[PDB]
């Protein structure tokens, strides 16, 4: 009911998307879809 401070979940959440997204960019250069 307020036991974890919001700003922590934000940074955590934030870094979580940042990683899934980076991954999709790495994949644009590897394997399927990389023209290679």
């Amino acid at each position: 009911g307020g036991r974890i401070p919001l700003w922590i979940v934000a940074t955590v959440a934030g870094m979580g998307v940042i990683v899934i997204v980076g991954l999709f960019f790495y994949g644009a250069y590897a394997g399927l879809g990389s023209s290679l």
């Binding site: 991954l23 790495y26 394997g31 399927l32």
Partner: protein, 34 residues
């Protein structure tokens, strides 16, 4: 003294669970080689 299962509840999960599921699928895809 709120409810935990509301209409709102159903709405978020109709979207939010296929999303995570879809995302792991899309992760695994980055690793497929031709």
């Amino acid at each position: 003294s709120y409810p935990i299962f509301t209409v709102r509840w159903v709405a978020v999960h109709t979207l939010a669970v296929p999303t995570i599921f879809f995302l792991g699928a899309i992760a695994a895809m980055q690793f497929i080689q031709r």
